[PDB]
Ligand binder design. Sequence first.
Ligand SMILES: NC(=O)c1ccc[n+]([C@@H]2O[C@H](COP(=O)([O-])OP(=O)(O)OC[C@H]3O[C@@H](n4cnc5c(N)ncnc54)[C@H](OP(=O)(O)O)[C@@H]3O)[C@@H](O)[C@H]2O)c1
Ligand SMILES: NC(=O)c1ccc[n+]([C@@H]2O[C@H](COP(=O)([O-])OP(=O)(O)OC[C@H]3O[C@@H](n4cnc5c(N)ncnc54)[C@H](OP(=O)(O)O)[C@@H]3O)[C@@H](O)[C@H]2O)c1
Ligand SMILES: [Cl-]
Lengths: 365, 365
Amino acid sequence: HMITAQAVLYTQHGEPKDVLFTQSFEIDDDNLAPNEVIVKTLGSPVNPSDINQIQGVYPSKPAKTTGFGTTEPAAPCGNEGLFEVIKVGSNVSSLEAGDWVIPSHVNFGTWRTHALGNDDDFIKLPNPAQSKANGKPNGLTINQGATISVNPLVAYLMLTHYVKLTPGKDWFIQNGGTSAVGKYASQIGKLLNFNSISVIRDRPNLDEVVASLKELGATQVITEDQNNSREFGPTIKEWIKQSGGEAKLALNCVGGKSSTGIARKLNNNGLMLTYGGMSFQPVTIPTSLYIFKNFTSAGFWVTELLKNNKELKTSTLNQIIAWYEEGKLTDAKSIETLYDGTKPLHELYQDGVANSKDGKQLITY
Amino acid sequence: HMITAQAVLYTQHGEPKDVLFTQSFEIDDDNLAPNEVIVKTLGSPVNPSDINQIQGVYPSKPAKTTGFGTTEPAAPCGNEGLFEVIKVGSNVSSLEAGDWVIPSHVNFGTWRTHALGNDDDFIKLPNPAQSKANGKPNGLTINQGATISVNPLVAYLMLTHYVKLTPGKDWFIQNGGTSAVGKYASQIGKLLNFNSISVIRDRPNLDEVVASLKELGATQVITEDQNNSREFGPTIKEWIKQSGGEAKLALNCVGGKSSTGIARKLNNNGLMLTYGGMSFQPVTIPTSLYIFKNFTSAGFWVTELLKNNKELKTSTLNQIIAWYEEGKLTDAKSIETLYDGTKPLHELYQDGVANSKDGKQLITY
Ligand SMILES: NC(=O)c1ccc[n+]([C@@H]2O[C@H](COP(=O)([O-])OP(=O)(O)OC[C@H]3O[C@@H](n4cnc5c(N)ncnc54)[C@H](OP(=O)(O)O)[C@@H]3O)[C@@H](O)[C@H]2O)c1
Ligand SMILES: NC(=O)c1ccc[n+]([C@@H]2O[C@H](COP(=O)([O-])OP(=O)(O)OC[C@H]3O[C@@H](n4cnc5c(N)ncnc54)[C@H](OP(=O)(O)O)[C@@H]3O)[C@@H](O)[C@H]2O)c1
Ligand SMILES: [Cl-]
């Protein structure tokens, strides 16, 4: 009657290859408070913020506790994930066994096999049987459920919450075009009828990558060299002139020369949202853009925007679910690794960290 | 009879030391159209925007004409100055001989001895004879009149038009603390009861400069080294936290490390206005300020804000005039050079351009 679980913890900040370890703990299914719930993990991803959190440079972090049975206070890892409800308490009515859920708050700890929480720690997603019962053509996959709460919401809110782009006319431009976030943004731009330019780094198979992004929804795809080119500017001005619209919004997750390049390409009174810094270079803007072109440069942080705005989180999440159920939105694919007990859980996540350069990593159970 | 006048012109853009020259022309005082007026210059300053215009890097320029009697099209120089009305046409009623005026629009050309214009090309200021007859305790000086239309309005509008600072609590921070604009900003901060920090470059007489800026109205004065110091940081945070207010607004006219320094000192949701670039370095902001502190970076250009908002221009100007007449506001002093005919006019402005590092230069007549 006792469940054995595993959790990935750390007692001090550092590099994941140095500080992470696995802790065994036990959950009692026969002694649940009226409002308590037991969930079983189906999958959880490795995202850049999860790593910064372990490193000690992310300013939103779970508290360290002895709640997993350690002598020293330890913090769990992972902020998003997909879970299946095993059992509910006497007073729980919003959930039942077999339901799919995600955490309702950050800092929950998702790099583990099981969790004990209250009903209000979770948000219910439709599982495939419930989607089918409502007549929808598709139900979510594990990867779509386990990654729905961050990257799709980031892309949707940056496109719709700050500048109103006229459908069929106006443009946005984004760097980091091959990222998971960049790929959701191209799809959402397409579904809302926005034009867009994606900036990516050059590669030998460039033609296949351009074709993939255009199928996802980018209108044009350029390299960072063309982004740096004064000779190439006029052709970007011509794209925009023929649409009848303006370039009003810039999305930056790189920094450095890349952030300067996409800023220069906006029309007057443009806005840039910085949500990332993959290059480790700061944002650099010439003085003449601010004064003579009325350029504005601001920030975006989804964790801080949704803290006390449940309504905005809910309706954005419902729109993403609806697009998945109708087949109009596809997920950024993951490289999956199944935990089966022959290898400590913390080493699967250490491998995911080390191989993130190959693309988004997902641990499944 | 016939008035012989002099004007500083150029036929192509370039460095002022290379392209400027003096042109003689004649104004006929006996044949004035009903709405024309003749003015005689009393003083006109050398401002950074005047130099950029001559260089060809400022996107607001007077047209080149042969109206001064040149065979090739030539442009005049200078955007602000103080003039005295010599004569008015039959149908002019808003001005009379003896009045003090400034240009009502940019690109008028103020580096010259005389001008012929329409009544509506000018804005009337009270001269000292009129201040005294109207019972006011003080009247304008030449230097106060010749510099009233730009730098005092810039300081006022940056402090009141973008963020509402709570009197007696909130702070703003500015670099370029010894500039003319910086000094008007300190005085307005005192008159509106805003707290402020001024950042200046170190000097041998630092203590005397600090005393002067505190007398003008700055709450604290720091050097660029302290602005850059990780160790001095905590002392600036205490000044603000102990006041009960927040640092909401940063004013940047330097660029480079200096703009990074003052941005780091703001509370969350801070705003920076870039209105200058004296260091010729771009604005550089760490990615973490945009994301984790919700920092925003924008521009300010007074010519464009007041272009079609004459009501806001008028009321801002009237407030500065009132403060001068009541003795509550003092001018940023200038180094003055008198034109007397023994030395071509264009060489006085060439010397003024070259000596701008010594402080604001004013040519008087
Ligand atoms: N502010 C927020 O709320 C928030 C929330 C979630 C995620 N984010 C941010 O969004 C960004 C992307 O997240 P993600 O989950 O989509 O990660 P991801 O799937 O792993 O994609 C990262 C991409 O960045 C590109 N890249 C790496 N180094 C680069 C460099 N030096 N220059 C240019 N491009 C580079 C890579 O492109 P290549 O194919 O060329 O290698 C890679 O595909 C990150 O900066 C992340 O922190 C922000
Ligand atoms: N956007 C607008 O609407 C607008 C309108 C008017 C003026 N402005 C701008 O406002 C700024 C000040 O104008 P101003 O008329 O007051 O000029 P100013 O009186 O001549 O003052 C010049 C200032 O620049 C500083 N400085 C010069 N070179 C520097 C460097 N390399 N590093 C750091 N500081 C440096 C000087 O400091 P020191 O004492 O140490 O030499 C001084 O404080 C200018 O950049 C001007 O272009 C903008
Ligand atoms: Cl007097």
